Ligand binder design. Structure first.
Ligand SMILES: OC[C@H]1O[C@H](O)[C@H](O)[C@@H](O)[C@H]1O
Ligand SMILES: OC[C@H]1O[C@H](O)[C@H](O)[C@@H](O)[C@H]1O
Ligand code: NA
Lengths: 346, 339
């Protein structure tokens, strides 16, 4: 079933229930996921209205871009030309600049395919918006099906050569309570290397480092507490995880990551080369989610994209987008129950 | 009474009915007026869904900007520096360039004051959007009251020196049907001068012309057909009216123009110095409004703003907006019925 209602400020809430009874909801404010529940329990973090997003934190569950992450000094080179983008984090351009796409009302249309329901959000980034050459016609399609798969399909075409590398900023918290840390969740991640940050400004260091057999090695499932309790420099620097992980094997067919808690697992598939993981290292900020003060480590993201830093480390990729060339990216989050035995205590 | 409903593509339709039974409706798609009707008749032109605006004509009823009108070569000088804006009509920048503020969904809040209801729409234009320096935080408040006054109040703040001169683009048609020409309406307008156009490109010619005692003198009520049947080169050039008229006396208290058809009249008030009047000179285009094929001259606008062409005729004014200054503008359309 599909249901729609006003969500505040002119945005709407689109809520779907599949045949298994799982419900998921989105809003056109930032083409974002608001909630995902199973048996009355929240699997992700979200607010109860639009204003909350605008007043507390506008990134959760949103579509962010045109470029996700930080671009050092907001400088990119596009077809031999240097362009300076909007700098909203010191000299850095973070998640596309200020008042970016995650803050806009996108138009949308819903398509019911029976076993699958699609929500296609559209927006146009005018040429020159926040310094990005355009115009860029973008669309984000979120779909949910009877197999409990939530898929995000991105498409974009630009009138001018530009850069494009958006991602989805959902936060998972299988505890269903923001006040409960994710340290008790199990993580499996198919990545042997990571990208270290230079310092507190969080720009990339310049190197790629192998993490095998360190507390950041999750090729084999381990509790998140291992990472959180680590005194590895990188962990101390950010007070948790806030890094890009390079996937070892590319392809939409491979389970790149799996997040488990008791009998629930979330699997991650994507066609992108990296996964930026940030564990809500907010300290005592205590943002209120459903009236629960969020704890430090009270959430975890899986931002699938080309790794941030390619400006400095060319080996990570190329996010340029040529005029008229069609961009596409697909990321899928699927839910399962009893995929494995996960019985621990913290 | 206030009613909110889906208007398509995620846009909302907000309808306000006052004590008098008059209904006015707006959409956040482009902070726009969609309808205005008394005793079952539409007073303005509008569509029945969001899609139509996007497919047919996105300007009707909309808030247009940042700059209303045509800018020659898309060129503006800011702090002595040349800036090229998006060009969407040949080399001109018309109505802020392509995919401008009129095609975006604005956020909004409704405030019910009893005798008056206000709908405040907001949108942030990012720095660099379509070539315009910013960011510009804008709000347009459309309000409707028990006295049948529809007021538009604009406010904006920019982080950087920029240009700003928006307008409301509603088209009136008291016939209540687009297939009927407004030639039968009577118009009165408090302007003794106008800005002629250079040619079919519609950029300004360069001068200011006195219209006293010409077919465009509406200082004294007159019927539209007059202007429409004139042989003035300017009328013939565009096949109607598509020009900036310079108000003789500025101030919101003065009735600047009045559009009348029989018992029903529309008065216009503004704090702007000019009114751009365009009579839907679309020829055979035939756009469909409520299933009715539109006729050449099947509508008329009253675009209150600083006249277009200031880039070439400074006397017209200046649309500069300095960083941190607060822009304000007010335009009122008051409805009256003779008893
Ligand atoms: O809260 C936004 C969040 O977005 C990304 O995950 C960044 O890596 C984090 O450092 C933080 O900026
Ligand atoms: O249709 C848009 C409309 O906008 C303004 O009124 C112009 O002066 C008219 O020529 C026309 O372009
Ligand atoms: Na809506």
């Amino acid at each position: 079933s599909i249901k729609i209602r006003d969500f505040g400020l002119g945005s709407d809430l689109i809520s779907l229930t599949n045949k298994a009874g799982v419900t998921i909801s989105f809003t056109n404010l930032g083409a974002r996921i608001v909630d995902w529940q199973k048996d009355g329990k929240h699997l992700i973090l979200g607010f109860d209205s639009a204003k909350e997003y605008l007043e507390k934190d506008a990134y959760p569950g949103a579509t962010v871009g045109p470029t996700a992450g930080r671009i050092k000094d907001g400088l990119v080179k596009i077809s031999g030309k240097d362009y300076i983008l909007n700098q909203n984090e010191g000299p850095q351009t973070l998640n596309g600049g200020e008042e970016s796409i995650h803050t806009k009302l996108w138009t949308y249309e819903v398509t019911d395919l029976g076993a699958e329901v699609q929500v296609k959000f559209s927006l146009v980034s005018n040429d020159g918006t926040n310094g990005y050459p355009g115009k860029i016609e973008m669309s984000v399609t979120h779909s949910f099906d009877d197999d409990n798969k939530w898929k995000i399909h991105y498409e974009a075409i630009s009138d001018k050569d530009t850069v494009f590398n958006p991602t989805g900023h959902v936060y998972f918290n299988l505890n269903g309570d923001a006040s409960e840390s994710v340290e008790n969740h199990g993580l499996r991640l198919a990545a042997s290397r990571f990208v270290p940050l230079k310092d507190q400004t969080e720009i990339v260091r310049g190197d790629i480092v192998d993490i095998k057999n360190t507390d950041l090695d999750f090729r084999q499932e381990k509790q998140l507490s291992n990472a959180f309790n680590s005194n590895m420099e990188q962990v101390q620097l950010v007070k948790g995880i806030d890094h890009p992980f390079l996937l070892d094997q590319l392809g939409l067919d491979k389970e790149q990551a799996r997040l488990t808690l008791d009998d629930t697992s979330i699997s991650v598939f994507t066609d992108q080369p990296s996964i930026v993981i940030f564990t809500a290292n907010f300290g005592d900020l205590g943002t209120l989610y459903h009236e629960k003060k969020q704890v430090h480590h009270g959430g975890i993201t899986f931002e699938c994209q080309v790794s941030p830093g390619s400006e400095q480390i060319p080996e990570l990729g190329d996010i340029s987008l040529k005029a008229g060339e069609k961009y596409q990216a697909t990321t899928i989050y699927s839910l399962h129950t009893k995929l494995e035995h996960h019985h621990h205590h913290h």
